[PDB]
A paper describes a structure:
Gp45 of ϕ11 was identified and characterized as the receptor-binding protein (RBP) of ϕ11 9. Furthermore, it was shown that ϕ11 was unable to bind to the cell wall in the absence of WTA–GlcNAc, identifying glycosylated WTA as the receptor. Although phages are the most abundant and diversified biological entity on earth, each phage can only infect a limited number of bacterial strains. This specific phage-host interaction is determined, in part, by the protein recognition device located at the tip of the phage tail, which engages a receptor at the bacterial cell surface. The RBP structure reveals a trimer with a complex fold that can be divided, from N- to C-terminus, into a “stem”, a “platform” and a “tower”.
The RBP of ϕ11 assembles into an elongated homotrimer, with overall dimensions of approximately 160 × 120 × 100 Å. The stem is formed by a long, severely bent triple α-helical coiled coil that features three interruptions: the first and third interruptions are both β-hairpin structures and the second is a short disordered region. A strong electron density feature suggesting the presence of a metal ion was observed at the junction between the first two bundles. Using an RBP crystal and extended X-ray absorption fine structure (EXAFS) spectroscopy, the identity of this ion was determined to be iron, which probably exists in its oxidized form Fe3+ (analyzed at SOLEIL beamline PX1). The Fe3+ ion is positioned along the 3-fold axis of the first helix bundle and coordinated by the side chains of His42 and His50 from each of the three monomers. We therefore suggest that it serves a different role, perhaps by helping to stabilize the bundles that undergo a sharp turn at the hinge. While the first and second helical bundles are collinear, the hinge introduces a sharp angle of ~30° between the second and the third bundle. Helix α3 (residues 88–97), a short triple helical coil located in the hinge, has an independent rotation axis not aligned to the remainders of the molecule. This helical bundle is followed by five-bladed β-propeller modules of the platform, which encompass residues 142–439 and form the midsection of the protein. Contacts between the three propeller domains are sparse, as each interface between two propeller domains buries a surface area of only 457 Å2 from solvent, and much of this surface is buried due to a helix-helix contact at the center of the trimer axis. The cavity is lined with polar residues (Gln165, Thr211, Gln330), which could serve to establish hydrogen bonds with the modelled GlcNAc molecule.
Author numbering:
A (entry chain A): -1 to 307, 309 to 376, 383 to 636
B (entry chain C): 3 to 378, 383 to 636
C (entry chain B): 2 to 636
Write the structure that this text describes.
Amino acid sequence: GSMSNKLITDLSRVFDYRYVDENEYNFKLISDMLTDFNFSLEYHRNKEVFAHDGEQIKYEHLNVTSNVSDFLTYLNGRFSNMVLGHNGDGINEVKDARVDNTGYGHKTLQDRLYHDYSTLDVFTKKVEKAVDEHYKEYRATEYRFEPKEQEPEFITDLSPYTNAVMQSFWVDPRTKIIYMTQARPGNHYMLSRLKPNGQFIDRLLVKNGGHGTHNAYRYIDGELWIYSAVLDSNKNNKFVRFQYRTGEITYGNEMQDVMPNIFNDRYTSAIYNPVENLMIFRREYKPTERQLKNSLNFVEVRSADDIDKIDKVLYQMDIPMEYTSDTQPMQGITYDAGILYWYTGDSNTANPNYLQGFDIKTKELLFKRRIDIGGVNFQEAEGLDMYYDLETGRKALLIGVTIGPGNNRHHSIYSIGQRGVNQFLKNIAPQVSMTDSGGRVKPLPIQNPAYLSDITEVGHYYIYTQDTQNALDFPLPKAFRDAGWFLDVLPGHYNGALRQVLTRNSTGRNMLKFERVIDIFNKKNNGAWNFCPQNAGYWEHIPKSITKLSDLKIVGLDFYITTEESNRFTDFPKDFKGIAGWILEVKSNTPGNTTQVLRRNNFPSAHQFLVRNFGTGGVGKWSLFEGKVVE
Amino acid sequence: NKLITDLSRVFDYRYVDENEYNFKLISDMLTDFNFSLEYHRNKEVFAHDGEQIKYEHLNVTSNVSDFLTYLNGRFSNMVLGHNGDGINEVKDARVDNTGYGHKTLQDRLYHDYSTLDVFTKKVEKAVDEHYKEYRATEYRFEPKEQEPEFITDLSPYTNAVMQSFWVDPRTKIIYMTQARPGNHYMLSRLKPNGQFIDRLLVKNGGHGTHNAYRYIDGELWIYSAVLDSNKNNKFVRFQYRTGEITYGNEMQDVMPNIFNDRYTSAIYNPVENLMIFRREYKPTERQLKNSLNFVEVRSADDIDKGIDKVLYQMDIPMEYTSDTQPMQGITYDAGILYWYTGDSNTANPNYLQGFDIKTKELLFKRRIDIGGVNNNFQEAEGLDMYYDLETGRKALLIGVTIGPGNNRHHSIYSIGQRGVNQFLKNIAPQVSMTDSGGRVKPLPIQNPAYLSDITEVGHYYIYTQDTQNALDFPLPKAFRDAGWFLDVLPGHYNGALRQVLTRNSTGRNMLKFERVIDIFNKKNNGAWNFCPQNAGYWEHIPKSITKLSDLKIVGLDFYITTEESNRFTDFPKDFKGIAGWILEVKSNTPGNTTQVLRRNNFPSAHQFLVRNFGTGGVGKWSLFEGKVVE
Amino acid sequence: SNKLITDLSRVFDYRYVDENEYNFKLISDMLTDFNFSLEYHRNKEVFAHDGEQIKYEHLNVTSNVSDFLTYLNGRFSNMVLGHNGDGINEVKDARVDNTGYGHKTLQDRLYHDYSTLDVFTKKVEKAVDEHYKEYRATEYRFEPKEQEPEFITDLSPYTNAVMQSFWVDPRTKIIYMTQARPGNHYMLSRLKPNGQFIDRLLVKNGGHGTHNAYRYIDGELWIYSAVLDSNKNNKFVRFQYRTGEITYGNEMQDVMPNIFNDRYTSAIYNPVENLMIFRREYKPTERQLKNSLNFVEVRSADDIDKGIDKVLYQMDIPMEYTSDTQPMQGITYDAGILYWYTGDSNTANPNYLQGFDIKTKELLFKRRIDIGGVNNNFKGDFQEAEGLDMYYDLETGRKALLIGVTIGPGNNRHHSIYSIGQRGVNQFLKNIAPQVSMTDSGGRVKPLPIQNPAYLSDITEVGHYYIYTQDTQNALDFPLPKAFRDAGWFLDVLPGHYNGALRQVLTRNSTGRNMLKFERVIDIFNKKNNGAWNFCPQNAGYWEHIPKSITKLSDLKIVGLDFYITTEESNRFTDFPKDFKGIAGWILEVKSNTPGNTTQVLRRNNFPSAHQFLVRNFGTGGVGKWSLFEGKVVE
Ligand SMILES: [Fe+3]
């Protein structure tokens, strides 16, 4: 009927006879295709009649290139002309040939041929020169990459929720997520993931991972892998690898050793180059070597495909001093097209930060350049990265900076890129806004949320009545949830505290306002809602389910109690029920206690107000205060 | 990439996944080797050198190149052997420009011509290659593989799915449609950052699936499908205006005798001056053709002249207008009809297809998944072909209405030529509360009648003189002696906003008021809420006020001096001109106010007077007096 | 040799995984071997083929390469060539071109060959020139006569006045703008490339500041300005930027005074050609009826440095470009062209951009500039003032014509830069600094400019900030005394007005205590004008303790900030009602009064007993006495 030579690429999800039968079928098809390729090559070489046309065959002799068919046609034509061609009047035919195409009569055939060839040779060389010059100009405009000369351009800020200097950063060319490291006090390092505008996404604490100076980030068949330098239970060095996940990770079965036998004799860290599929290693020489080699750090270039199994150092180079302390310690490392980029060094403050370039094969210093920024008109180094654009193949040298003293630590990425790379990186994600791009309220991330504290991105939001019903952390009990609210999520501090402001969407009722601090990393640390009184001249009613005034404990939130409603309250002053309207005031006290005031809404009669304190201190009695009517 | 040779020793997800991966890689490698061998056989120019080709005749083996050299050399020697004594001028001509002496004139001419022919072909090859590289870098346009890039959000004040959008290349205004109940559609105009400008309700317009937008001698025209009074299909044109429009004298019929036999809508291509029509088959026609829609390509000039001539026509197969894959977007560019389909839910992906309009063939079908960073499910919503006025560069715009159910947020994504997306993203920066330099934004009106007319979010400042005319100010005119900071904040998706007024005071308290406004109807505007804040300053009652009953703002205290107390006609009769007092204004029912006058006594006994007044009547003052203690 | 296993194990065993591993490795090796074999066949194999496998077909001949070679060799032998005369056979043979075509004559063959190559090379040359012309038009097109101006940024000085001029520093990206002031002064404000205010200089008796020449000399920026002396005489000078105030005298250097001080003289500096372009006025004695008011001189900046008087090119500006309805607003120069921007704000007539060829004096173009669009809501009819500038990019040498605008009216006055640039210039200028944000780009709190600041009023840029406990300790303008400084605070700096009043909001970072909130207005140009902090009460139900170091209730003066006093604590207050110490818990309320005075209420935290509250007023009015109010216990 038909027979498809196409392989089964969608397999059975269960190990069956069918799963085996699909694999055998594929291997049978592949075996036949391979046997056919082997037969085809042999047949091409030995039997195929018209393996090629003669036009596909080069014929070259003494600086002349033609093809076999055209040269055969040429030879046959030379024969045919000698047989068929008329014998001319020699001299007169030669005399006629002295006249060039413009009609100019040269003195000799050789003069004419010389003039013709020279005219075309000079012309074609002039066209070739213009081609090379236009191409050189085009390539310089588009692909110029000079880290020794170009001024770094600001790309973005990086906003982790950790107050520490940045060790390293890596921009994922596929997802555009930024992976950054920050050392933590207990020989741990924090690995934060950010959006390309620097906005925090999530994080991973690498427990006993050391300082996190740098990691190698490698994609393997659409899956991302992180190659990290760590420490075990005994604080001994280990070069391991693992896939990202949020939360925590420690040396054990959760991560894979690479080649422990050759790397764990020293501190071993690495960076991955996707262009050449190389894995560049930065290994610390043992303390005893620092006195003899005068080189505190060394770099070894190895292959990634070869790192998946075999041991082979392609090129090795010692990092001289002063490129590793005291006034110039290592702050950044990257690699591109046979050049090792090295960023030094501390600074705070006096001494400038330097970017160096070394030829990894010759070990020579190619350039040393001062790196300084003046756009926030001191500044300290924080990592290097080599960005390779997935769509265009274009590149940029990324320079990470951490600016300010201690508390005021802010991080930024600067770049030296090829044409359009910096503009692309700066504009992947617009900077964080309180609204959408058009100035409208941002959408909520959850429908009828269990926790309002789950809204962790700053912004102006709106919560409808039905979306407040499930809230477990709402400022008002469920009996009061009859309205829509404006929600403002504002920045807090550098470690995860944010502010949240709720305002009731009321035109004919007062705009109730509450504010709190939330800890986005632990809701148990969330602050209580602060009621901020504001009033438009409207009354506030008590929900009908409430029969005790003692249930009303929000400080500064008044209620109106009509004459009829006053009968419903079991804790209402006994001899003051069903006679007048009252304003209930709820005032401050100690934790577990409340102060309440009921003030009469009297018109011709004497003013009366009743005060009580109640809670853990006991159920206090009401005390009456009465005034004297005057004119 | 590389074949996985170390497989999982446990039959699980990774085993099946990497087993499938290997077979996909093997399939590609087999196809590549077959292509290489076929290309070697049929197309490679210089598949071989002649020295690799055996020439064997009488048990003597040579190669093709050396035998060709031998034959050519024989020929020339034969010519020299039958040339008499030659011609010296011809002998001289055997020497080429380098000084190399060839055997015959023919050998010299051959060599010269070949040298120049090979050289000029080498220059031509470099020209074509440099130009191909340049054109690929600058003008690559591949909707089948390029990843859509976020351009902007669209922010209408209509909470409905977007039907269509069009980016005006001259003004940069975005024209978007949203279907409304009652068979109307709303046409909203937005800034290129999505900010709402104004809108037009197209009464009995239908769903507003798409309009054709065309400039005719500097005048913008909108070609729409609309309904008449009898609910009959009318293909029309009209120019934009705000408010409302309906079928009649305000709309011009466009070839009614040709299009009004069915539902007809259009899109306009400015490059080829084509109007592309999407038309419906009637229920009876649908089963026979297995198609709901058909597309007609016509000249816009022919439309202007009223001449009926279908240049190219194509039926859309039902699978592209189905329950699972309904039409969500349509556009056209350089002989290709782009068709966007998708469902709102069910984990079925949305698709972008491209059809060759001339041959009717499907060129590509691709899943459109905005699995990016600006997204962190998708509801497909329109296509547009943006054509840059300055450069002629283009982009395929993809509209998305995202969000789980309600409320809807809209965004434009793009597949563009070099620099187009960067340009579109940055025409207008995203909305800010300040100007670009962090300063207060300018007010849209000087001495405004209504503060509610300030409808764009932002931080503003109103000078004393610009508060004088306000008809909706939180304080009466007697109190308008200061500048105020005005903050206009987002409210909800439908048009409610918040407004906050704060008095610019250094030596007086910073009075603060807040309200909700309805930007579409000021009658729905909320009352101003006073938010008390105090720096320790007193607040004076304007001299023009002689009744304490005029002071009704809750929480706003006033100080009354001994002399001032005499002026108030409603001051407790026996308490005038004897002391200073603090007037407190407290909460009550609507139409009523509570007031407290507390004495500013120093050595004498404290006194305070309370009253309630308004619709409940003019309540009497009640005195409360304390006992001096140590 | 090894073959693929096609009969696999029927159980997911170790044998199954191995057989699959073996096959994949064997497939990979076979494909590598096939690819090596094909590459070797193409490039190195000697006798890759026999000539019989290679097709030779031409017209009525169908053959293979080997048989055709045999045929040609055979033709050699049986060919009978005549002894046709001296050079006869050689000339005849030369008539055959490289394709094997036999021309009738040597001249015909040479004509054909030359013409073929001449036509071909001219075709290649035409494509080269066309590709280059297209490339240059795409990259370097600069047409102020037709290109549409693009919005770059707003400019945000702290001065309410029309902008006279602006200059974008290509090295620092700082924008230098001038605004005329009453009293014949001009304000020179420096801004970030997003328009954010940095600092300013008041050029006392500087005149209008119509335009300055900005020039770098050995890494030093110099400003060449028209200024006036004490006698209101015109002085052409230079000075380096400083903040504050400057006036004619020792701080300003005269620039060829004997040449330029006979009239009003202002300049612009072109860095490409190192030219100083002068705009000068004709004096009334030099003018007849409708004569021109202004003239422009082109001079070398080297000649200016050396004090050499040499006008390279001069041109009078026709009166129609310096009129009541078309007065001068902007001036710039580029590549032999003088750009002139005219406009009258209140007459509703249009604004124009003109280009003049400075050498020939001819008008090249006149176009209406209407920048009313999506970026200005679309306030085109309100274009109030304008300036021009030529931006020259340091990195690329690319350029842009910058068009400055002020859109009015009066108080609603706002400034913007629009541009007509070469490819990528506008995108570059728009994105040097992102527009001002309340947060960093990732939505986090912005860093503070000072550690443990003396004044919070020194934080003058809008934004959300955080101050740690230790950084509040030495604040001289904090809303609470030092005894209360035990917490971190959120600080919000908000815009105020156009002249420099900003708002500051402080909120206590409290989860288990109330979030104390204070707000004030600051004058960023004079802290003596700073307002007092307003306390905004908000309460989560927590009590507030009086620091143990405080023993006077009279020290607690913040209005609306309540404190709780325990029975034990009530004994330490020297101003507590004498007969009410150590008997109960109390809530202290602090209420409004006149400046210099405070009202305090002590309300008892009684449970079964009668409620009591005590009121007092104290301060400049005297130390008022406490008054007791007692209630009656009811059921
Ligand atoms: Fe071959």
